[PDB]
Structure 1
């Protein structure tokens, strides 16, 4: 009997039986709606072919593939099976507490038991061997630690003598009635004095601190919140995995390893099957010295990818209601489950789980064989519970270390777990890799121990930009592929028809995962993630869910301690609105914030609020010097003290550039892995800025973020300053850039910056062609960059606007020389508005951009304040703009056969099309079915539709009149007769 219990189900004799009554064919006309919801006493069953079987049996003729040694008490390994392990790969790491007493009957060598006596944290390395064998290697020995000021503590209690301290902490822990679990001993702690320095400030001098080790995070946590009343505490937030990686040089979170002898030729101990803590084929106890990095050896082992996607159906009153997991009537009816070799890429298994009989189409089956793909295996069931258990039984038994699909984090996994926990009261702590007590939860964002979930939806929202992110949509843009035959509203209808129509549902389900697969092996996300994990020193599962600061803290921590630091704990030239007929050039700085940090030596360690005790070294040379926020600040440079961030980033930039110089002289396969790394360094570098300015995150320092803000500003003001001085005349520009020869346009020449924002400047170029300006702009930026700023800082050129409506602040419309329209901080469309108001509103903005007469006339408006155009007539070039509004009025009034164009719709609801019609004096009580209007020759409501077009035009083209909506309203009125106002 396992020394630690298996909490997943290896038997159920009874359970909650829920199934749609349609499934009954012994079925009167009336008894076929809704759902059965009762208790049934019998084992859960699977059907596959004419065959059946208990869902929880392992042995003979099992319907689905397993990778499982132990199944609730029985060892299913071949009598003989005893492989030896040397090298093995690691994809995931767990932290758990083990207690010596609970493990007595496990057959563990005393060095291990020693490590967990009252208690101890065990770090379990998860992965597999070259042969495919599933491994869990249990690292004993790692303790978490944290620091506290010696003399400060030594005074406020009182006792240098390191045992006195430990006793006082053990005595602190008794008094909390929160499970001291009789850990009221001075021996559950070691406390050593070391010299060190709080990272903050230039002045701060090395003090003496107590390093104190602890046996469990449980303990550490309490002492954070309680032992430190006034006393300052350092690196208490640092988990055991991260101590295990950082204190063992070279060690990684994702890599190959080998076990070897240690200190006194100590050897890793294989575990007896009955003390396995996970579902792996082999397990071992060891300490860090029994482990070594196995560099050179690099190839991904045969780990598996499960790719699934679920389909549901609504019960209750209205079967076209979107399904809700909390409803017992609203059932998961099918799950598409695909199993790949992740090292190979091959699709090994196609499984479809199905509530009710399901007969896949012959056509879909022909298409699978024809593509050299596995024949699907259809598992069918009478109830939702039987099918959910089956799926979860497969999730435990096959144990895909990797899992994927589309929106599975947002819809699929939440739906299925809501059902498992709430409706069926099944516990999940045992269904991951651990046999019990493991994490298996979704939040608002899922965490399943020993399972790396990568959701393709988010990956795709991260590489490609689109109008839509639906799969069939995504499948047509990215895989250039076309399939379009399903809608959640059709499911019920089809479900009720019979087993063939359920097959169709199953087809589109399998095909859905097929496409998601094809995408995962297109974008190889796990490899972007491994690389970050591998680089940041963190578990792969935290490279996705856990955000920003995590990826950077760890590295900051390693460096910080090298240096002998400790980390404390939780304790007016922007736009003048107007239109532009001359080209506008857009300069951007590349990774501005990180390049500032590095160039200007900015760190926790190098800043100060004091002028004194600053080595009194000297201003200018040794000092940065800034009027930051409230007051004056100072930052030392890389000769006096070099910044910890600075170092992180420089090292990462030198790494990227040395990796990038290699991409072309390596193999195709070597280049695919260097690209992922080269991109990983970029994900991590773009993080360091953010890391600084989280006011309640780990190591904030708002006075670095804010100095970077104010340096960002100065730099672009300098770029402004420069361009105006240097390029005021075309002659100097021709001397720097001889190709300007063929760029001189008719006008007078003038180069002026018009918009400044975060990291980009807009430069209006009179007398120049839009034609070669993007290429000349690179050079300009290169030139500027090489002339004004310190390395990494790099200004570049993206983009020339042939024409530009500069509305405001962060709001503009432009056509891009050589491209499309770009619209920022506005839309010219509304899903809610009728076609006609949208099409015309749009036609207007196109006249302004694409009609050269309207474009000059629009430009000329800028030569004159809004109010002065009220006095005088608008420039004639706008005749065509007015022709469009006039024209729209006529579109409405006339017996004009397209009423459809004026239809509004604001399930049952919206969908009812209507139109607003002419005539107490009524208020949109003049809705009407369209057909009725037509059939009765009813006029549309001129005043209504037109005033909506006038309003929309008015908000889009205020810019031509300094954003005064009033003046705009008045001037566009001149283009239409007053009797139509």
Structure 2
């Protein structure tokens, strides 16, 4: 029989391109020791380990590397009678795929699943682990993408009388498509219904009737959205099936624990037979969303595996010291270190070294690892680059680490490996992720950042977290070379074997290749220490849970999608649908009198809340607000020369305001629990509160991106305009209320002994986007941070609407103002700060 859907990774191989350095032939005379061999060879790829020899692709008892694999090439290697009961499972990632009833006809799927994919359907696959550490895939059927179109606009254009007709028109349009890739589509592939909704833009916008159109496929949806009737605005055609699955099932998360349960008519999840598995899992199920519930109370991460890896390459052209280029057949990967950790316990479980050529690790290294209590390295030796790279990808498929890390693996190691596998060898990669074929496995190097030469990676079912990104984001350093970072962060100074050394070491023999290997392993151990110090997976999963997107999109997609998805949830609840697209300048100088610094706390979010700014509260038209009282019911403000109106919360509440309010409440609840929490809970709660802060701080930016997911440049501009007005108001208030010491003392009598011998004055000397510096001649610094707290409260109360909050941040005893955003000063505690 064999698998229902073909496995595309290699499970057999009998011929391959053999490329190896000739220096590995110490049996050859000296003139024949330079360059690489490069020829075809007709034998099975092999690996050598400790005197034994195996075929790379053979699966059975005596393998050289660990496996967490049930099927291999369509043979079921599970023990006889393997049949674990699954109740709860953890989901770390979610895939979207199309299945076709016809293609699945000989998989014994129950009828309710077949109906969902007749003739085609989107299947949401939840990937994860049981408590027992079994790898699971749960295939959810019955999620449809949908978009909206204005009913009046559609009827007037297409002469539609009823939803049946619209379905005919869309079916017809696809039939007639260029390239004909929708032959066989009928008006049965669509369902249209009439609903009442409101466009999220502008206060005056009335509710209207829309067609809501359900589609079975993302491919069909993307075509309709950019081809069908381009004069008719579409709404929410950009929303993926995963998002509909998450938002349409209250409580569902993209990362967390679930339980299988009975569905509506006591339906049950159906276990798939092994030959119908779509992924490299131990167990697979078919279900609908009603067979799933969130499992509250479960919070511990299951035993996911982390692979930390690093490659070493050897340029083999005319210059041994040239940077290696993957397209050059002679520029080889020569080693790969691969450390496998349990992500729940942080324990290092396996230390693997893949070596092109024989490789004898130094006894000193082996003794050191033993002393540190770490696993004894397994050295896998190979005769050619292909055999080695195939073994590494074989390990990736068979062990299936859910998380992968390294240092600069996104910009160097993965691109280099995948360039060799695709361009030199012609290995398809689409079965090397979690899916057994047809899965995403792609790197794309990205533009604009042309100097930094950045990249993204997507590998289905694998979360790649590059520690270089984590550390450049999190720590300020002069150099982000791994050795410099290991000194700065781990306080773990170590030697560098330089790239200049590698060619001479490689050529010497197995002992010196062993020195290369030691240094490659030490590289990966350091990265592992960095990973387990910063725990970036806990940060990223916190954001994924909050934003309703998978952890993969959390890493690689930008800030906008986070806010968008949260907005989409709220907007739907409220009946909206989202359409598819000088006096503050510093006079430079040195001040020896104290300079108090007042900062607004989360200024832009606070403005959005305080002034009820939103897409939905804005009007560009005075007649929109003619029924309302000025001041009492709306804010009128000039922004870029236009008059804008924003109605107040009692007229209509801002969606953005609701999001921010609710997040800030949630962050307050979390930060209140941290002091009573146990130390592991404190780590999780800390990751959660931090995730909330990043999403809140992204709302302003979300509104200001022209050509973004849902721009409202009017909101963005209003925020900066109110910002500027607030700083000026603060300056004016300070200049007026506290021009004399008597007035200061009258408000704060603890000032009475802070009075220094010099003349009293209080003046704003600098102001940036959210802070103001106040020069307090005639006051001593000592009590001034306390009086500053009270000045800040006082101003906040006098001038501004909650939740706007001015705070006294610090006091400089001495300060050098250089320019905008450039200053040096000493804080009252004696510490120097430079910006």
Instruction: Identify the TM-score tier after normalising by the shorter chain.
Output: over 0.9
Closer, same or farther: CA 503–772 of 1 in aligned 2, 3 Å: farther
Deviation beyond 6 Å, 4+ runs, structure 1: none
Deviation at 1:580, TM superposition (A): 3.4
CA contact (8 A) 1:150 1:160 kept: no
CA distance in 2, matches of 1:341, 1:100: 39
Deviation at 1:740, TM superposition (A): 4.0
CA distance in 2, matches of 1:96, 1:420: 25
Deviation at 1:786, TM superposition (A): 3.5
Closer, same or farther: CA 647–571 of 1 in aligned 2, 3 Å: farther
- Selected match of 2:806 from 795, 803, 818: 795
Closer, same or farther: CA 734–572 of 1 in aligned 2, 3 Å: closer
TM-score by length of 2: 0.96
Deviation at 1:678, TM superposition (A): 0.9
- Selected match of 1:753 from 760, 764, 772: 764
Q: Deviations over 1:78-103 (max 9, x none)?
A: 12112221111111100011111111
Closer, same or farther: CA 37–815 of 1 in aligned 2, 3 Å: farther
Aligned residue number for residue 417 of structure 1: 418
Deviation at 1:750, TM superposition (A): 1.9
CA distance in 2, matches of 1:103, 1:764: 75
Report which stretch shifted further, 174-183 or 676-685.
174-183
CA contact (8 A) 1:173 1:183 kept: no
CA contact (8 A) 1:118 1:183 kept: no
Report which stretch shifted further, 484-493 or 104-113.
484-493
Report which stretch shifted further, 641-650 or 11-20.
11-20
CA distance in 2, matches of 1:742, 1:512: 59
What secondary structure does 1:200 align onto? coil
Structure 1, unmatched stretches of 5+, are 824-981
CA distance in 1, matches of 2:419, 2:582: 37
What secondary structure does 2:179 align onto? coil
CA distance in 1, matches of 2:193, 2:84: 43
Report which stretch shifted further, 476-485 or 651-660.
476-485
Deviation at 1:368, TM superposition (A): 1.3
Q: Deviations over 1:257-293 (max 9, x none)?
A: 1112222222211111111110001111111111111
Closer, same or farther: CA 371–183 of 1 in aligned 2, 3 Å: same
Deviation at 1:179, TM superposition (A): 3.8
Q: Deviations over 1:204-253 (max 9, x none)?
A: 01111111100101111111112232112111111000111111111111
Q: Deviations over 1:90-134 (max 9, x none)?
A: 111000111111111111112111111121111001001111111
Closer, same or farther: CA 597–335 of 1 in aligned 2, 3 Å: same
CA distance in 1, matches of 2:53, 2:806: 68
What secondary structure does 2:622 align onto? coil
CA distance in 1, matches of 2:263, 2:804: 48
Report which stretch shifted further, 149-158 or 116-125.
149-158
Q: Deviations over 1:37-76 (max 9, x none)?
A: 2222211111100011111110131000000011112111
TM-score by length of 1: 0.82
CA distance in 2, matches of 1:604, 1:129: 43
CA contact (8 A) 2:406 2:467 kept: yes
Deviation at 1:407, TM superposition (A): 1.2
Deviation at 1:816, TM superposition (A): 4.8
Closer, same or farther: CA 723–427 of 1 in aligned 2, 3 Å: same
Kindly indicate whether residue 606 of structure 2 is the aligned counterpart of residue 605 of structure 1.
Answer: no
CA contact (8 A) 1:48 1:377 kept: yes
What secondary structure does 2:381 align onto? strand
Structure 2, unmatched stretches of 5+, are 446-455
Deviation at 1:815, TM superposition (A): 4.8
Aligned residue number for residue 317 of structure 2: 316
CA contact (8 A) 2:584 2:768 kept: no
What secondary structure does 1:30 align onto? helix
Kindly indicate whether residue 102 of structure 2 is the aligned counterpart of residue 91 of structure 1.
Answer: no
CA distance in 2, matches of 1:665, 1:813: 39
What secondary structure does 2:569 align onto? helix
Closer, same or farther: CA 15–819 of 1 in aligned 2, 3 Å: farther
Deviation at 1:780, TM superposition (A): 3.0
What secondary structure does 1:478 align onto? helix
Report which stretch shifted further, 555-564 or 611-620.
611-620
Deviation at 1:736, TM superposition (A): 4.2
Q: Deviations over 1:477-522 (max 9, x none)?
A: 2222221232222211222222112212211211222122122222
Report which stretch shifted further, 260-269 or 52-61.
260-269
CA distance in 2, matches of 1:153, 1:45: 63
Deviation at 1:776, TM superposition (A): 4.2
Aligned residue number for residue 775 of structure 1: 786
Deviation at 1:770, TM superposition (A): 4.7
Closer, same or farther: CA 751–270 of 1 in aligned 2, 3 Å: same
CA contact (8 A) 2:430 2:438 kept: yes
Equivalences, count: 823
What secondary structure does 1:169 align onto? helix
Closer, same or farther: CA 552–206 of 1 in aligned 2, 3 Å: same
Deviation at 1:34, TM superposition (A): 2.4
CA contact (8 A) 1:663 1:675 kept: yes
CA contact (8 A) 2:433 2:440 kept: yes
CA distance in 1, matches of 2:171, 2:11: 42
CA distance in 1, matches of 2:188, 2:803: 52
CA contact (8 A) 2:174 2:182 kept: no
CA distance in 2, matches of 1:457, 1:20: 31
CA distance in 2, matches of 1:134, 1:290: 19
CA distance in 2, matches of 1:655, 1:130: 29
Deviation at 1:768, TM superposition (A): 3.4
Report which stretch shifted further, 425-434 or 784-793.
784-793
CA contact (8 A) 2:761 2:776 kept: yes
What secondary structure does 1:378 align onto? strand
CA contact (8 A) 1:745 1:769 kept: yes
- Selected match of 2:685 from 658, 674, 694: 674
CA distance in 2, matches of 1:429, 1:550: 26
CA contact (8 A) 1:626 1:634 kept: yes
CA distance in 2, matches of 1:385, 1:100: 38
Deviation at 1:739, TM superposition (A): 5.0
Deviation at 1:668, TM superposition (A): 2.2
Q: Which has the larger radius of gyration?
A: 1
Q: Deviations over 1:690-721 (max 9, x none)?
A: 11111101110000000001000011101111
Q: Deviations over 1:813-834 (max 9, x none)?
A: 44555456555xxxxxxxxxxx
Deviation at 1:459, TM superposition (A): 1.5
Aligned residue number for residue 472 of structure 1: 483
Deviation at 1:792, TM superposition (A): 2.8
What secondary structure does 1:413 align onto? helix
Report which stretch shifted further, 58-67 or 75-84.
75-84
What secondary structure does 2:31 align onto? coil
CA distance in 2, matches of 1:601, 1:351: 57
Kindly indicate whether residue 35 of structure 2 is the aligned counterpart of residue 34 of structure 1.
Answer: yes
Deviation at 1:470, TM superposition (A): 2.0
CA contact (8 A) 2:760 2:778 kept: yes
Report which stretch shifted further, 618-627 or 750-759.
750-759
CA contact (8 A) 1:140 1:287 kept: yes
Aligned residue number for residue 450 of structure 2: none
Report which stretch shifted further, 602-611 or 785-794.
785-794
CA contact (8 A) 1:170 1:183 kept: no
Report which stretch shifted further, 804-813 or 526-535.
804-813
Deviation at 1:802, TM superposition (A): 4.1
Q: Let me know the Cα RMSD of the aligned residues.
A: 2.2
CA distance in 1, matches of 2:830, 2:13: 64
CA distance in 1, matches of 2:425, 2:311: 18
Closer, same or farther: CA 796–264 of 1 in aligned 2, 3 Å: same
Kindly indicate whether residue 359 of structure 2 is the aligned counterpart of residue 348 of structure 1.
Answer: no
CA contact (8 A) 1:314 1:323 kept: yes
Report which stretch shifted further, 12-21 or 66-75.
12-21
Report which stretch shifted further, 39-48 or 702-711.
39-48
Kindly indicate whether residue 662 of structure 2 is the aligned counterpart of residue 661 of structure 1.
Answer: no
Deviation at 1:644, TM superposition (A): 0.2
CA distance in 1, matches of 2:547, 2:582: 24
Q: Deviations over 1:827-877 (max 9, x none)?
A: xxxxxxxxxxxxxxxxxxxxxxxxxxxxxxxxxxxxxxxxxxxxxxxxxxx
What secondary structure does 1:187 align onto? coil
Q: Deviations over 1:952-974 (max 9, x none)?
A: xxxxxxxxxxxxxxxxxxxxxxx
What secondary structure does 1:710 align onto? helix
CA distance in 2, matches of 1:351, 1:761: 56
CA distance in 2, matches of 1:744, 1:328: 78
CA contact (8 A) 2:614 2:654 kept: yes
CA distance in 1, matches of 2:461, 2:570: 29
CA distance in 2, matches of 1:732, 1:373: 68
CA contact (8 A) 1:531 1:676 kept: yes
Report which stretch shifted further, 209-218 or 811-820.
811-820
Closer, same or farther: CA 728–219 of 1 in aligned 2, 3 Å: same
Q: Deviations over 1:349-380 (max 9, x none)?
A: 11111111111111111111112211111111
Aligned residue number for residue 405 of structure 2: 404
